[PDB]
Amino acid sequence: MWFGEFGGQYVPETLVGPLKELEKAYKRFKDDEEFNRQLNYYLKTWAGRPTPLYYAKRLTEKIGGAKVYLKREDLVHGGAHKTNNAIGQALLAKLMGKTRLIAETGAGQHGVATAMAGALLGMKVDIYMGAEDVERQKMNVFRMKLLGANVIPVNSGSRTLKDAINEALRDWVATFEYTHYLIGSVVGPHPYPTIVRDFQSVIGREAKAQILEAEGQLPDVIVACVGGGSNAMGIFYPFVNDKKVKLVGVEAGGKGLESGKHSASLNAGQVGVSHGMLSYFLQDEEGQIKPSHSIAPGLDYPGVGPEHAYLKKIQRAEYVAVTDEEALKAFHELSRTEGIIPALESAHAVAYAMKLAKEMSRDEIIIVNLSGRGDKDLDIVLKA
Amino acid sequence: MWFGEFGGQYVPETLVGPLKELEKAYKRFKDDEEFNRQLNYYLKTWAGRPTPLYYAKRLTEKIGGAKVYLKREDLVHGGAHKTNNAIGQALLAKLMGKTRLIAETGAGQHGVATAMAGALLGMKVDIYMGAEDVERQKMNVFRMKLLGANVIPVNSGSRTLKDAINEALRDWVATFEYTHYLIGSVVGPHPYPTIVRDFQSVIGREAKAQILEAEGQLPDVIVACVGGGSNAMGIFYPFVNDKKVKLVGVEAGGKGLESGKHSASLNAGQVGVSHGMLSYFLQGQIKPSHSIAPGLDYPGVGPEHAYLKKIQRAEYVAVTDEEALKAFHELSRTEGIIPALESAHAVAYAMKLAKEMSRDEIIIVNLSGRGDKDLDIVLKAS
Numbered sequence: 001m002w003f004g005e006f007g008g009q010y011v012p013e014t015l016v017g018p019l020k021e022l023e024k025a026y027k028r029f030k031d032d033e034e035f036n037r038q039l040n041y042y043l044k045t046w047a048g049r050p051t052p053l054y055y056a057k058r059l060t061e062k063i064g065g066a067k068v069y070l071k072r073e074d075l076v077h078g079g080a081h082k083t084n085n086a087i088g089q090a091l092l093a094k095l096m097g098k099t100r101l102i103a104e105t106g107a108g109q110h111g112v113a114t115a116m117a118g119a120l121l122g123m124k125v126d127i128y129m130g131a132e133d134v135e136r137q138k139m140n141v142f143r144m145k146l147l148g149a150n151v152i153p154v155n156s157g158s159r160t161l162k163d164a165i166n167e168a169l170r171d172w173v174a175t176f177e178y179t180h181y182l183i184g185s186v187v188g189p190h191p192y193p194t195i196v197r198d199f200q201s202v203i204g205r206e207a208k209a210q211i212l213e214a215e216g217q218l219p220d221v222i223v224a225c226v227g228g229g230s231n232a233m234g235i236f237y238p239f240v241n242d243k244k245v246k247l248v249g250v251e252a253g254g255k256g257l258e259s260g261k262h263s264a265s266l267n268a269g270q271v272g273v274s275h276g277m278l279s280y281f282l283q284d285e286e287g288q289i290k291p292s293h294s295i296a297p298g299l300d301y302p303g304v305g306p307e308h309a310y311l312k313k314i315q316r317a318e319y320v321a322v323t324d325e326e327a328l329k330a331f332h333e334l335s336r337t338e339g340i341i342p343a344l345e346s347a348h349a350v351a352y353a354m355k356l357a358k359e360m361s362r363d364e365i366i367i368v369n370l371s372g373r374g375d376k377d378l379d380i381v382l383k384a
Numbered sequence: 385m386w387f388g389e390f391g392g393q394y395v396p397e398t399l400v401g402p403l404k405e406l407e408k409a410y411k412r413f414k415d416d417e418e419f420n421r422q423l424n425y426y427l428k429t430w431a432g433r434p435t436p437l438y439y440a441k442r443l444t445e446k447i448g449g450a451k452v453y454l455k456r457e458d459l460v461h462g463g464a465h466k467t468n469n470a471i472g473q474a475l476l477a478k479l480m481g482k483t484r485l486i487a488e489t490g491a492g493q494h495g496v497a498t499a500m501a502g503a504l505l506g507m508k509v510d511i512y513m514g515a516e517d518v519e520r521q522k523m524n525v526f527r528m529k530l531l532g533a534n535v536i537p538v539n540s541g542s543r544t545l546k547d548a549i550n551e552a553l554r555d556w557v558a559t560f561e562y563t564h565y566l567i568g569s570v571v572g573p574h575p576y577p578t579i580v581r582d583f584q585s586v587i588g589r590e591a592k593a594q595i596l597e598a599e600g601q602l603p604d605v606i607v608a609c610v611g612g613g614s615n616a617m618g619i620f621y622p623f624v625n626d627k628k629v630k631l632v633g634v635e636a637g638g639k640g641l642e643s644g645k646h647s648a649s650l651n652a653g654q655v656g657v658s659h660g661m662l663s664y665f666l667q668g669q670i671k672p673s674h675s676i677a678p679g680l681d682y683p684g685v686g687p688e689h690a691y692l693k694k695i696q697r698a699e700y701v702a703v704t705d706e707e708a709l710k711a712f713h714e715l716s717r718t719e720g721i722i723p724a725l726e727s728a729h730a731v732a733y734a735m736k737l738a739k740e741m742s743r744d745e746i747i748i749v750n751l752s753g754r755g756d757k758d759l760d761i762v763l764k765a766s
């Protein structure tokens with residue numbers, strides 16, 4: 001339940017039962033032969049795993065310091081890492097006898113991933129999405145509709161991701177006998193932070209085998225963007241006990257950390273409770289969760305998962321921020337230099353890795369998690 | 385040079401030297417270990433090959449006949465099979481000492497693939513695109529620009545794909561010393577039909593190993609959409625000498641074969657010489673095609689398909705806009721895969737064919753691309 005002081009299960013009594021049933025089923029199926037056979041079968045044949053590890057040679061030589069490798073989650077079916085978790089949980093839900101999936105989404109990538117997994121397994125899918133987010137994600141909303149899902153616009157509160165989560169929790173209270181709430185990041189009440197990290201850890205396990213193949217040794221640094229924290233936990237987790245491997249999480253710096261328009265929960269937030277968890281949140285003086293800002297629509301969650309709060313506290317991982325400007329610069333740079341158009345979320349990680357590589361030796365190795373592709377962001381990049 | 389009577393190299397004398405230089409370079413490099421080292425390295429680590437072969441269980445059960453497997457070229461970097469050929473030819477060009485790639489594109493996928501390959505290998509890229517196509521492919525034009533390529537609108541003729549090819553040929557004639565014309569399908573003068581097919585044959589080589597792993601036997605039928613014909617040749621070619629494997633190419637039937645608003649060159653075209661090759665073309669003058677699928681816009685077809693049709697090694701059919709759009713929706717809802725509108729033609733035909741076959745028989749459908757590029761077309765139609 002806990003990662004030191006962070007995490008927990010801060011929910012009404014009506015969700016204790018459902019969460020207990022979920023934890024029970026997860027413990028039964030996580031190491032089950034048939035569950036893992038099916039999961040790996042879908043990840044391979046439908047999602048296209050393993051994704052490659054790409055040496056960005058041109059980008060590396062241009063900067064003139066450390067080698068930059070890219071873990072290519074942009075190539076997963078759906079165009080982002082979210083699919084890995086969507087399949088895992090959707091299959092778990094099917095084996096628990098559930099017939100319906102609900103999920104929140106901000107950027108729309110988790111919504112699409114959930115709609116895809118639901119279609120694959122023959123389940124109903126309703127996606128809760130803040131009305132502000134529906135308005136700016138027309139194409140992802142259309143993708144979800146083509147996949148057979150219904151997108152439910154959320155008009156309560158600030159009409160954003162935090163509000164979508166609140167409506168989904170309210171739905172799940174009444175519908176849990178037949179509905180699984182498919183949370184999309186390492187957030188929410190226990191057991192969700194643990195489950196989502198476990199279903200994304202395939203990223204790190206592949207990346208470890210692939211870097212040993214390419215370089216014969218573990219990397220010096222792993223860099224990943226951090227919204228709620230799932231792509232970062234996925235690549236980090238298999239290296240946590242390799243003590244010489246530095247772990248760097250990159251939050252959205254927005255218009256700057258001192259501007260009050262960013263999504264850097266670990267950097268600038270405070271401890272608090274929301275969505276069932278004790279973690280870091282951007283909060284005002286009256287304990288209200290604040291709206292976050294980022295040019296990357298997927299770095300929109302005002303909190304961060306408790307396992308990242310914990311890794312920061314024990315100083316196992318370092319957390320930094322990169323601005324909208326720096327992320328954009330990286331979006332263009334990677335597109336031009338390596339012929340890969342990254343998601344704006346992922347461009348934050350690329351932006352930091354480029355800064356860091358310049359300060360490091362040519363013998364050293366950085367792995368960047370490229371959490372998604374940039375096709376979804378083309379209009380945003382045009383406008384900025 | 386020829387596939388039966390089809391193909392050849394019917395070009396002005398100014399193109400003969402350049403084509404002979406390309407032929408010689410290709411013969412040198414095609415089985416060279418060093419060339420193949422670099423090509424396989426980029427296909428694996430950058431493009432993400434091999435793509436999976438997926439058993440569409442829900443689609444199969446619903447139809448109630450043959451097993452339907454999908455070769456997942458939708459998962460290749462860039463979202464379509466075009467990348468396989470773009471990398472192979474861009475690398476060839478690089479090794480020949482060229483500094484610039486030019487390419488035609490209609491739908492914009494070959495344009496993007498060429499832009500990506502050029503960015504990867506440090507080569508200038510100019511994409512010729514008919515002004516009518518530039519106009520309705522806003523996002524692909526923008527992906528190309530983000531990738532560092534210049535898009536040159538074509539305002540001559542009908543301002544579509546055939547005219548882009550004409551302009552690119554005029555450019556290449558002048559600039560071939562340092563420019564490679566990176567043709568996107570199995571069309572044009574020898575050696576292009578052969579080169580493009582060879583660079584797409586990885587699709588079939590994977591699919592063969594994958595179906596032997598999954599089912600312990602070769603498939604009964606392979607189904608692929610046919611524009612110029614590259615994704616179909618890619619998956620077909622490694623099975624040509626497996627006598628019991630049926631090969632089915634699916635052309636764009638458009639508004640219906642009787643309407644004359646389609647792109648079914650093999651079904652309803654006439655044999656003739658154009659773009660340096662003897663093949664089937666729609667027409668007395670060659671006309672622009674119609675299809676809901678922007679990628680099935682070439683008025684002609686590759687000469688190797690003309691040949692397979694004539695010897696009856698492959699069967700060719702047509703699927704309408706309406707049927708393709710139905711299949712786009714069906715695959716999205718039933719399997720959670722949004723296909724390209726081009727590929728949806730193959731899916732549509734495969735669904736018709738599977739119904740008539742037994743439950744132990746196997747169809748492989750080539751899913752040539754993903755449908756993200758077609759979302760606005762499908763929004764307007766539906």
Ligand SMILES: Cc1ncc(COP(=O)(O)O)c(CN[C@@H](CO)C(=O)O)c1O
Binds near residue numbers: 081110184297343
């Ligand atoms: C491509 C990509 N990369 C990174 C992230 C950040 O999330 P993570 O920190 O859980 O990986 C997201 C989040 N996207 C979420 C939240 O808005 C969604 O609902 O789609 C993403 O879409």
Ligand SMILES: Cc1ncc(COP(=O)(O)O)c(CN[C@@H](CO)C(=O)O)c1O
Binds near residue numbers: 609682726
């Ligand atoms: C996804 C997809 N599937 C199929 C085809 C048909 O081409 P083929 O028959 O050469 O495979 C295309 C063609 N696309 C070409 C022609 O317009 C282009 O310039 O982009 C495509 O983009």
Ligand code: NA
Binds near residue numbers: 051052433
């Ligand atoms: Na792959």
Ligand code: NA
Binds near residue numbers: 292299300302304
């Ligand atoms: Na945050």
Ligand code: NA
Binds near residue numbers: 649684
């Ligand atoms: Na045609």
